[PDB]
């Protein structure tokens, strides 16, 4: 169980003149959900707060433990870069995570091998890895502890198509509950059985089936049989089943939600 109860976090600025997320509410149990939002919407900041890495207003509970009361929880994992020491070798990180999270070295090595990332990658310092390599290694570290609950940031960004498919197989197999955040729409076709929320309108809005989203259309206005109605600046944007408008599948970029209106 992950509960966000009236969470607020500052995204930019300070004091009287800041921009923040406010009144963020979400409960997730027994499943992974995807939070979709444009770059800059605060998705990664939300995951950092849930992972104990940033202050926030309101309360976040993981299995009834408020996040301020958690120094480490062996059953939770994140791939966020803040959880890993860019400076030491991957092998060094593997040793820490074996104890910190109960990471299984053999399973980790199995993932690296499936990802066709060489045996030598262990000997490499984390900071020195490419963006695609870094995220694959960090996602693999998160999953190889067989977490019950996982917070995954942009696990597909800068990752080639083949390795996206490999890591998706592991994402689906490991960590039954959690939150995956992404701005990338081209990956949703592998996640039809999952629920999604949109971070837009200064709100977390949803849930909607990804299966239904992928075959939906998006239109201005509040429509009657809509799968989901989004509130944005002042307007309403409806996600509708079948052909009332342009295909969500062809959207290309989430920023185009603002544009269609």
């Amino acid at each position: 169980m992950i509960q966000l109860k009236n969470v607020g976090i500052t995204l930019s600025g300070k004091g009287y003149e800041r921009f923040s997320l406010e009144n963020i509410n979400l409960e997730v149990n027994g499943e992974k959900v995807i939070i979709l939002g444009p770059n800059g919407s605060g998705k990664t900041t939300l995951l950092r707060a849930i992972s104990g890495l940033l202050p926030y207003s309101g309360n976040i509970f993981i299995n009834g433990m408020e996040v301020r009361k958690i120094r480490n929880y062996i059953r939770y994992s994140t791939n966020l870069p803040e959880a890993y020491e860019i400076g030491v070798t991957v092998n060094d990180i593997v040793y820490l995570y074996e104890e910190l999270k109960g990471l299984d070295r053999d399973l980790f090595l199995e993932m690296l091998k499936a990802l066709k990332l060489g045996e030598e990658i262990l000997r490499r310092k984390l900071y020195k890895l490419s963006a695609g390599q870094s995220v694959l290694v960090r996602t693999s570290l998160a999953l190889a502890s067989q977490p019950e609950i996982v917070g995954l940031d942009e696990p597909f960004e800068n990752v080639d198509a083949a390795r996206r498919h490999v890591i998706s197989r592991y994402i689906k197999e490991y960590g039954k509950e959690g939150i995956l955040v992404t701005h990338e729409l081209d990956m949703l076709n592998l996640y039809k059985e999952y629920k999604a929320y949109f971070l837009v309108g200064n709100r977390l809005q949803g849930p909607i089936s990804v299966s239904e989203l992928l075959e939906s259309s998006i239109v201005e206005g509040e429509r009657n049989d809509a799968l989901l109605v989004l509130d944005i600046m002042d307007k309403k944007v409806s996600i509708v089943k079948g052909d009332l408008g342009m295909k969500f599948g062809a959207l290309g970029s989430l920023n185009r939600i603002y544009g269609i209106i």
Side-chain angles (χ1 to χ4, degrees), residues 1-232 234-261:
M1 180 66 70
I2 301 164
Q3 297 163 267
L4 284 57
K5 314 297 288 183
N6 194 40
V7 175
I9 327 172
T10 296
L11 301 186
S12 49
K14 72 182 189 303
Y16 295 132
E17 307 300 337
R18 74 188 182 280
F19 182 73
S20 53
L21 293 178
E22 302 286 344
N23 312 121
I24 301 300
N25 292 288
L26 175 69
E27 297 195 345
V28 179
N29 65 280
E31 66 186 315
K32 285 174 246 85
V33 302
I34 298 164
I35 292 180
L36 296 171
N39 273 335
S41 57
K43 307 180 311 289
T44 297
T45 296
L46 218 45
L47 227 39
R48 283 171 72 200
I50 296 167
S51 311
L53 298 162
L54 234 35
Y56 51 95
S57 62
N59 290 101
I60 301 170
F61 300 87
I62 302 174
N63 288 337
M65 308 188 176
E66 214 280 319
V67 159
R68 295 170 184 105
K69 296 182 177 186
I70 303 172
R71 172 66 180 76
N72 184 52
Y73 180 27
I74 53 160
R75 302 190 205 256
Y76 177 83
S77 289
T78 182
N79 71 349
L80 283 162
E82 290 88 342
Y84 306 97
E85 291 167 23
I86 238 180
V88 284
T89 200
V90 169
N91 188 41
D92 281 346
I93 302 169
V94 172
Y95 282 119
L96 172 61
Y97 274 77
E98 289 178 44
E99 296 306 304
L100 190 64
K101 297 301 182 177
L103 178 153
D104 181 288
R105 177 177 283 271
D106 277 3
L107 177 52
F108 178 76
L109 294 181
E110 165 190 329
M111 298 175 172
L112 285 194
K113 181 189 173 175
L115 287 163
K116 301 168 184 320
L117 297 175
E119 228 316 294
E120 66 277 20
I121 202 168
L122 278 73
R123 305 198 156 184
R124 302 191 70 195
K125 316 226 197 71
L126 182 53
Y127 65 70
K128 206 169 64 182
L129 301 185
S130 66
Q133 287 179 333
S134 178
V135 79
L136 288 168
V137 167
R138 284 181 284 107
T139 298
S140 295
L141 289 162
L143 301 174
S145 62
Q146 296 202 253
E148 295 301 340
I149 306 180
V150 70
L152 297 173
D153 186 33
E154 294 283 10
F156 312 111
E157 187 158 20
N158 308 309
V159 174
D160 77 287
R163 288 172 193 195
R164 282 174 162 199
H165 277 74
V166 173
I167 201 64
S168 185
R169 287 165 190 128
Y170 285 120
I171 289 170
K172 298 164 79 174
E173 172 172 20
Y174 296 100
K176 183 173 86 178
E177 174 178 304
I179 289 166
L180 186 159
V181 312
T182 188
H183 71 93
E184 311 194 293
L185 299 169
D186 66 359
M187 219 77 229
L188 293 175
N189 66 267
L190 283 179
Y191 291 86
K192 303 173 166 190
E193 68 278 52
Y194 289 53
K195 294 185 196 148
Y197 292 80
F198 288 88
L199 189 55
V200 285
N202 305 132
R203 292 149 201 267
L204 209 43
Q205 320 192 36
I208 182 174
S209 168
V210 171
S211 176
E212 311 224 47
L213 189 60
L214 282 164
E215 295 304 333
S216 60
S217 297
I218 195 151
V219 307
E220 201 182 345
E222 175 158 32
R223 300 283 154 99
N224 270 53
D225 195 44
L227 292 153
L228 179 65
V229 182
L230 302 172
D231 308 310
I232 302 171
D234 269 341
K235 317 179 103 163
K236 297 208 180 274
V237 170
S238 292
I239 299 169
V240 301
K241 200 161 194 77
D243 265 291
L244 281 81
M246 193 196 133
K247 299 290 178 189
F248 181 90
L251 222 71
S253 162
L254 289 157
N255 278 125
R256 309 219 180 105
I257 298 176
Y258 297 122
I260 75 130
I261 65 179

